Amino acid sequence: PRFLKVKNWETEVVLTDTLHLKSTLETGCTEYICMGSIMHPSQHARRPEDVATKDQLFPLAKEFIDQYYSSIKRFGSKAHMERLEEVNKEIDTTSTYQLKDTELIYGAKHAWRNASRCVGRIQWSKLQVFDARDCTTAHGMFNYICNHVKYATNKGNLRSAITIFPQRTDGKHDFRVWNSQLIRYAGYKQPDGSTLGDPANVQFTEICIQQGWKPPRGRFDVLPLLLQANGNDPELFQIPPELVLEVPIRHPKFEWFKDLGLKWYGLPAVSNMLLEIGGLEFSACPFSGWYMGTQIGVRDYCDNSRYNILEEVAKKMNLDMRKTSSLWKDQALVEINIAVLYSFQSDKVTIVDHHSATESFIKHMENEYRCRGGCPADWVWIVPPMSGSITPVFHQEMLNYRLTPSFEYQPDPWNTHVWK
Amino acid sequence: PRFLKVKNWETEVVLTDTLHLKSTLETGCTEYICMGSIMHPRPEDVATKDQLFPLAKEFIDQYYSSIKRFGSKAHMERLEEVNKEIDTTSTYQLKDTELIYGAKHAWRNASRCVGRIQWSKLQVFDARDCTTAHGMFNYICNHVKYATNKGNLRSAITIFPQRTDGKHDFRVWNSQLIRYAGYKQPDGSTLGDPANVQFTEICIQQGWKPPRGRFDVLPLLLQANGNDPELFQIPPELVLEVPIRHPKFEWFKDLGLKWYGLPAVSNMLLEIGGLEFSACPFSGWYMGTQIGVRDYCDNSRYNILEEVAKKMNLDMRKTSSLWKDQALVEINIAVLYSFQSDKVTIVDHHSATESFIKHMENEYRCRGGCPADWVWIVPPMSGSITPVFHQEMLNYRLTPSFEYQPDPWNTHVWKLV
Ligand code: HEM
Ligand code: HEM
Ligand SMILES: C[C@H](O)[C@H](O)[C@H]1CNc2nc(N)[nH]c(=O)c2N1
Ligand SMILES: C[C@H](O)[C@H](O)[C@H]1CNc2nc(N)[nH]c(=O)c2N1
Ligand SMILES: [Zn+2]
């Protein structure tokens, strides 16, 4: 370091990174090993296991409050020094402190801005922040989440949003959305060993069923919300169906494609991540933007028990499926992604293709390097899962590093929860 | 750090890496920045005696360990013999067995190579007695003929004399042994392979008379003993080529495209025991997606990707039609179909990545790990429908290794006036 250059090998544009000097947490890499493809490479946290002591929390608070007041050209201002004194006394009397609305908004936007894995970040400063820190019950969380879904969906003109529930206190009163996303389809393990619905959600579906949910065992079964407030046992809630925008998937040239009876939901809303601002941990911070078409996992969706939507498309396309070298998987994959984009666009539901999104991300990187001196970026996650080398991010070198505020992963609550 | 675990999020298979404890050279990353997607993180800069000794001992220790003779009298005398050579001559010479072992493990250690399940079957051609570019040409012709094997390709490496003082390097100035020329036209269009315009200009500048055709095999530009490079024309009957056609699009053959059967990387440096083999052309066989025919500019400023989409009557107005994606798949279908039809070895990215996963698991079992560069192992298309996408990998640099080295035209001290 001192500065680190990244090069685009198509355009030969070189960007020079100084922002990485502000990085706090370990990537997991060393001089001798690179962990760039490990999902969860580092356990390096800014605060310890449980209720931090003052000398563990206040340095983190000061750093964030310093960062925030710097960001508004108010460093050392009257309001800044007062805020530090305020945070100091709050920690002294409660072992935590409470963000101001401006600080919460600033922190959530920057956690997104710092999300190295997110290709959508050109939009980062246009995040609608819903303060839900007054919420006390799962019912209130359900209400907050319904309003989020309604606002974000916006009749298909999707709007970036995050709803932030009360921060962690002692780790035994966590707010959690047990759902990984607010809207997902059930996965049903079948007695003949196979899977019905979305196979990614089989375990959570079973948890819901175990928690009393009566599964329709139908086709595209929207999973209930499993909401945990104040560390209590989670509670089941059915999202009002009129709040769940769905796009029937059809194909602009394959008339048979709609006969697959496929649909997907318009709003992707990640709800299992942890938002970390100045040592404060918001274990329930569901956020939503809009889909990049490649994200829509309708390809893995199982409508029967012995075949998959990829294979089913390839069959209806009369592709030879004996040998891989026919690229029938690649052919069908493209066609499914054409259908998804075509269907969302026809229904006027916000969606971005991976060409437009990666092109915007390159534009975002240029902006960030110009104004901020860097942009943390995880090539492994930024490059789209299809047609990687014909998108502009492929030949774009990227530096990955951990800035705070940040979105963090956290354990699945059912592994960690003590029932009552 | 005893153990490191990599998980496959598709299969849930967890592998434990101990082999990373043996790594010695940098990855480029630091504890706070990952440089995993950075491409690469003086001639006098040859190993001093004191630098060379421990690199040599590290290699010899590793070799005698591999043949279950570590600490043996043979091991000890080889060590002593190597140190005497470094003491007197400031360098030392690999035994033939050590050279073979070393080239094979440089491939085995190539974290960016998806084809490593084959590593132990490499044919090693010892060309360390070579002294001139003519001799290099002869050695390279024999490599091409042996590796091509009338389309039943065989992996091979040809190793020219190691670096001495940095002023006597052997170099293949070609990036691959067989490439097509690229010619920039006055009107900004490109004829042939736009990837090779720069090297083509060097060749013409060295006196090569270019055919200025569409698929002109470039001349070999060969440098021996630090002398100026010399041009040689590969005998055309040694260059196996595949006309590219499509199993369904009859018009694809009318694009008049072909590609060469033998990918043979010639610009890397082979490092064994601190010794540097600056000329070590090696070859296996293509993965279909490597073949750069799509970037090829037959006739004009437009390339085969665009031309194929045009013939496919694709809506090229908007990106969200995914016409680029569709034409990309069709080009890769045509490439695999053509090679297979002509019985020229090729692997598709599905087969290649599935084999890599098997290879990686076997390496974890028998070797304690497999350094792998996800950024380069995942194919350049359809990444997530291949098994490596969900495969966590640990990247680390083991020696012997293949390394990048500067382009020779940037560093060569020209002799001829
Ligand atoms: C506005 C449109 C957005 C688009 C197109 C987008 C796109 C993406 C994509 C493609 C990924 C890779 C993960 C995957 O493949 O599923 C990702 C990851 C991520 N996004 Fe965005 N995103 C958007 C909005 C947002 C917002 C509003 C936030 C938070 C305020 C956010 C935070 C994140 C985070 C933290 C990750 C990493 C998640 C993980 O590690 O699993 N994104 N995004
Ligand atoms: C036998 C079939 C082989 C296949 C299918 C194969 C495939 C590949 C692929 C797909 C890459 C990624 C870089 C790229 O996109 O070109 C790669 C990289 C590499 N391969 Fe292999 N390879 C094979 C044989 C070999 C052999 C015989 C050697 C050396 C003895 C070798 C050494 C390397 C090295 C050093 C790299 C890294 C190149 C770089 O960093 O730019 N490979 N290989
Ligand atoms: C093992 C691998 O690193 C991991 O599965 C990552 C790879 N890159 C990814 N990239 C995106 N966008 N989404 C993903 O889930 C993943 N998975
Ligand atoms: C910027 C990026 O890291 C670089 O261009 C790499 C990415 N991965 C790659 N992977 C393969 N197989 N081949 C390549 O040329 C590249 N390019
Ligand atoms: Zn790294």
Numbering used by the authors:
A (entry chain B): 303 to 722
B (entry chain A): 303 to 343, 349 to 724
Q: What do the authors report?
A:
Nitric oxide (NO) is an important signaling molecule critical in the cardiovascular, neuronal, and immune systems. The enzyme responsible for generating NO is nitric oxide synthase (NOS), a P450-like heme thiolate enzyme that oxidizes l-arginine to NO and L-citrulline. Humans and other mammals express three different NOS isoforms: endothelial NOS (eNOS), neuronal NOS (nNOS), and inducible NOS (iNOS). nNOS is an important therapeutic target since the overproduction of NO by nNOS in the brain is associated with a number of neurodegenerative diseases. Thus, nNOS is an attractive target for therapeutic intervention. In our efforts to develop inhibitors selective for neuronal nitric oxide synthase (nNOS) over endothelial nitric oxide synthase (eNOS), we found that nNOS can undergo conformational changes in response to inhibitor binding that does not readily occur in eNOS.
We asked the questions, how can the inhibitor displace BH4, and does the inhibitor displacing BH4 in hnNOS bind synergistically or independently from the inhibitor bound in the active site? Most unexpected, however, was that the same backbone changes in the region of hnNOS residues 598–611 were observed when two molecules bind to wild-type hnNOS occurred in the compound 4-soaked hnNOS E597Q structure, even though no inhibitor was bound in the active site and BH4 remained bound in its site. Therefore, the simple elimination of one charge in the active site results in this structural change without the need for inhibitor binding. This result underscores the complex interplay between the active site and the region that undergoes the conformational change several Ångströms away. This suggests that when two inhibitors bind, the first one enters the active site and hydrogen bonds with the active site Glu, lowering the energetic barrier to the conformational change required to bind the second molecule that displaces BH4.
